[PDB]
């Protein structure tokens, strides 16, 4: 009856809270929660469409509802296929992120920090603010300019791009800035 | 009855479409549409909460629903107050964007392109890709590295920060990169 409306209101409140906090803060766990919510978004839409269709007032409404449900389902299946292809290529669990199918590997201090990249571009910039590193708008922890990675890479289905550190500048002692430019590509 | 569910499904579909297109593409009109939808998000939550409260199954559900509605309402009112303060300071219609209360003025080729900034930071980076300029993740049209603005500014309620071009590098002929570092602050 009204339970659907209440849960929808709670969902919108949660989305607002994540939006107003995850935008300013890029904590890894908050980021993962936002990813999980974004993934959940699709089944919510499918459930809404099917529930509207089953209680269709007239034939046209049910038909359009089921058509939209099928559209969302095929979109979800295609995105799952691409995600599984990316996982097979990179064998990393980050490939199943609902954001996209491009991964950014950052060899930071012994480990490699893989993050979803929204677009593979010729230039990716790095900015260090108060000692905290952000590459492609992703908080990768504490780092300083002198030990910044000299090479990163971006992994996509049937492609692998390698970047190298361009010019690196130091701003106000602890803050800083840098860029990563493509110099190589590897298919398969 | 089920009209609310169908409109909610359509709203989620529209949000997905904007998310999957506005993320990769930063067209000004698409950006404005996304801003309008994000603004609409709040009244949708308020309507859902009030509709749940009026048809409360039990007293506790209605009480929590009205409490959440009041919380959302006071948040909306406070954000409106901050937005109006920013507009009074800057007298620009961009100050009413639902994203935040920080504006980025970019003096680009005679005009000034004001965009909502999600955080005022000591360093803001600029990247030119194939001749298209993005500052703080905002598409500001066609530009090249040599004529890049030598000074930008970030406007906030009771503060005004001025940046100046740091090091500027050219990548692969047409693409490029640059940074903007704070050198001054102006209160009031």
């Amino acid at each position, epitope marked *: 009856l009204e339970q659907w409306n209440l849960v929808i209101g709670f969902l919108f409140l949660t989305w607002i809270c994540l939006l107003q906090f995850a935008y300013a803060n890029r904590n890894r766990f908050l980021y993962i929660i936002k990813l999980i919510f974004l993934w959940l978004l699709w089944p919510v839409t499918l459930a809404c469409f099917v529930l509207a269709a089953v209680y269709r007032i007239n034939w046209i409404t049910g038909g359009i509802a089921i058509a939209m449900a099928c559209l969302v389902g095929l979109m979800w299946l295609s995105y799952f296929i691409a995600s599984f292809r990316l996982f097979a290529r990179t*064998r990393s669990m980050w490939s199943f992120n609902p954001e996209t199918n491009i991964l950014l590997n950052v*060899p930071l*201090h*012994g480990t*490699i920090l893989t993050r979803p990249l929204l677009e593979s571009e*010729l230039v990716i910039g790095a900015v260090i603010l108060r000692g905290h590193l952000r590459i492609a708008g992703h908080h990768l922890g504490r780092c300083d300019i002198k030990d910044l*990675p*000299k*090479e990163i*890479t971006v992994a996509t289905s049937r492609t692998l791009s*390698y970047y*190298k550190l*361009g*010019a690196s500048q130091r701003v106000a002692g602890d803050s800083g800035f840098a860029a990563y*430019s*493509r*110099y*190589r*590509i*590897g*298919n*398969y | 009855l089920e009209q609310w569910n169908l409109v909610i499904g359509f709203l989620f579909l529209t949000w997905i479409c904007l998310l999957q297109f506005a993320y990769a593409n930063r067209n000004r009109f698409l950006y404005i549409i996304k801003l309008i939808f994000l603004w609409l998000l709040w009244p949708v939550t308020l309507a859902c909460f009030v509709l749940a409260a009026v048809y409360r199954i039990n007293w506790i559900t209605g009480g929590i629903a009205i409490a959440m509605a009041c919380l959302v309402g006071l948040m909306w009112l406070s954000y409106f107050i901050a937005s109006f303060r920013l507009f009074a300071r800057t007298r620009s219609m961009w100050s009413f964007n639902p994203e935040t209360n920080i504006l980025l003025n970019v003096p680009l080729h005679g005009t000034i392109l004001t965009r909502p900034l999600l955080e005022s930071e000591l360093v803001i980076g600029a990247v030119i890709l*194939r001749g298209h300029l993005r500052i703080a993740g905002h598409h500001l049209g066609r530009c090249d590295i040599k004529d890049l603005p030598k000074e930008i500014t970030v406007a906030t309620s009771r503060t005004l920060s001025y940046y100046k071009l740091g090091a500027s590098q*050219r*990548v*692969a*002929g047409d*693409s490029g990169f640059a940074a903007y570092s704070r050198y001054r602050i102006g209160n009031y």
Partner: antibody, heavy 113, light 112 residues
Framework: EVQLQQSGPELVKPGASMKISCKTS????????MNWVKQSHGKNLEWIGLINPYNGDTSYNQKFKGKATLTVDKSSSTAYMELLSLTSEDSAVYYCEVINTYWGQGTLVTVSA | DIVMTQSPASLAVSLGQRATISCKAS??????????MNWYQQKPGQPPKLLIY???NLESGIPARFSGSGSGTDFTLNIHPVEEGDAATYYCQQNNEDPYTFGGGTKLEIKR
């Protein structure tokens, strides 16, 4: 900066395998891919392949597939290249670069009996 | 496959002049509208030294007298002013398609 120290020259009989090490210093060994290059006759630079020393997946030239195998030892930061079934054609200098910027000094391989 | 064809096989220029090294690709090496073409320098008995990458990007620490140009199939390396320590061999490499191929190399001679 980064350093790449290889094994010295090695005289190898025909048809006998050998291993060319490339010890890395000045940077975390895992994080930069290691390319291998061959310069024959003193001027013909030929790409052999690259290895990601983190997960261990390589990518060879199809000419050197089955002739060269790329391995790593994260413990000692030492990358390896093993030449299989050496021939008079394989006499050359084998370099190891990382980001196309830092190279080794070259392992001169002489395949003669 | 790709075959980088350098030209000329040997060069001879006096000091203070400009030296131009060509490198033609059998096929266009464009990717996403960009050409990935490195230029190396190898003095005798020494490993190659990267000068340019992405066909126009000067490597960090290289004197700003090497310039990478060209696009499509025809690429070009320009040295000006040719100095006393530029006698070496210059190679063009495409970091675009497996296998990454080198050019035959052109020997830069200094006139005196």
């Amino acid at each position: 900066e980064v350093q790449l120290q290889q094994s010295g020259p090695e005289l190898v009989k025909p048809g006998a395998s050998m291993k060319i090490s490339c010890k890395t210093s000045g940077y975390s060994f895992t994080g930069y891919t290691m390319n291998w290059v061959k310069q024959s006759h003193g001027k013909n630079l030929e790409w052999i392949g690259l290895i990601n020393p983190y997960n261990g997946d390589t990518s060879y030239n199809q000419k050197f597939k089955g002739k060269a195998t790329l391995t790593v030892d994260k413990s000692s930061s030492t990358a390896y290249m093993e030449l299989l079934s050496l021939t008079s054609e394989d006499s050359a200098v084998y370099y190891c670069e990382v980001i196309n910027t830092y190279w080794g000094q070259g392992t001169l391989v002489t395949v003669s009996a | 496959d790709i075959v980088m064809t350098q030209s000329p096989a040997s060069l001879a220029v006096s000091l203070g002049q400009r030296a131009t090294i060509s490198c033609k690709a059998s096929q266009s090496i464009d990717y996403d509208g960009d050409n990935y073409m490195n230029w190396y320098q190898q003095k005798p008995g020494q490993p190659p030294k990267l000068l340019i990458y992405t066909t126009s990007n000067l490597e960090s620490g290289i004197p700003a007298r090497f310039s990478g140009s060209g696009s499509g199939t025809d690429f070009t390396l320009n040295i000006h002013p040719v100095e006393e320590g530029d006698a070496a061999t210059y190679y063009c490499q495409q970091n675009n398609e497996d296998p990454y191929t080198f050019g035959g190399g052109t020997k830069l001679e200094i006139k005196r």
